[PDB]
Ligand binder design. Structure first.
Ligand SMILES: [Fe+3]
Ligand SMILES: [Fe+3]
Ligand SMILES: [Fe+3]
Ligand SMILES: [Fe+3]
Ligand SMILES: [Fe+3]
Ligand code: NA
Ligand SMILES: [Zn+2]
Ligand SMILES: [Zn+2]
Ligand SMILES: [Zn+2]
Ligand SMILES: [Zn+2]
Ligand SMILES: [Zn+2]
Ligand SMILES: [Zn+2]
Lengths: 157, 162
């Protein structure tokens, strides 16, 4: 019961974990739409594989919350909502299927970059706070985002 | 269906749309940075963000040259991604009770913004290269490198279980 309820670095870490939890849920909802829009088979397949990984990433975040002593929960993330809105609106503006695949690759890379920033931040805070225990899960998620980004950077349309 | 349904027809059109989107983001960043500077307590963070504000103004000047080369105005696309990043940064700052915690949040949100810009510049460079725009590739690469350097400086700012 405070208006400014983020009082400590531990509170900030918990808030960030709830923010990324919500973001992973939203990505699981957004990805099928992107996969349906994708023409290039490698792009469609790559996104489908990352959708499966994102489902696993949520399970790893459930493990993080369990290690911290609580049930999982999310908080709204305006950054992922804005990224998803931008991707959806831009897709509607594109007439050519190959141009659309280029936009899908770029928007997917922007999402991976947001995830890389967030996991990197959460890991650094966790380590500063003596929470090495949760870093193993966060690092597994982070490295899947890095891998997805790298693979997107190489997609040949 | 929105205003411009199916109006992006070519990779040149998509590059133009992406450049207008990052231009808008840079403009928004010039508006947001003074707020983050005022909120920041640590002088290396506050004075450091002031330097990134000066660099962002230079990046807009670089983009102005790119638009000149395309013969197109830089206005015309808003960026829901930067708008969401900046409003998340605002929201989170409003929830924080402690100056040291607020500085940690400022760094993290500034790093998230640098990562967005790094994603977009990387994409735009690749499209500009494919389209044969050598100077535009150089200008965008210069901008990209400033965002990478800013992110690294944020990763290194020396600020600060049962
Ligand atoms: Fe993820
Ligand atoms: Fe967020
Ligand atoms: Fe991802
Ligand atoms: Fe954008
Ligand atoms: Fe920047
Ligand atoms: Na039209
Ligand atoms: Zn648009
Ligand atoms: Zn910056
Ligand atoms: Zn910038
Ligand atoms: Zn919040
Ligand atoms: Zn909150
Ligand atoms: Zn703890």
């Amino acid at each position: 019961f405070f208006s400014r309820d983020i009082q400590t670095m531990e509170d900030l870490l918990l808030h960030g974990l709830r923010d990324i939890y919500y973001a992973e849920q939203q990505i699981t909802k957004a990805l099928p739409k992107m996969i349906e829009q994708a023409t290039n088979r490698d792009l469609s397949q790559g996104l489908t594989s990352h959708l499966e990984e994102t489902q696993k990433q949520i399970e790893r975040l459930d493990q993080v919350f369990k290690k911290l002593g609580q049930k999982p929960s999310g908080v709204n993330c305006p950054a992922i909502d804005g990224l998803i809105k931008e991707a959806d609106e831009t897709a509607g503006e594109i007439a050519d299927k190959t141009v659309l695949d280029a936009a899908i690759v770029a928007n997917a890379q922007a999402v991976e970059h947001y995830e890389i920033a967030r996991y990197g931040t959460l890991i650094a805070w966790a380590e500063e706070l003596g929470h090495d225990d949760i870093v193993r899960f966060l690092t597994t998620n982070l490295n899947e985002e890095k891998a997805a980004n790298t693979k997107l950077n190489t997609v040949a349309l």
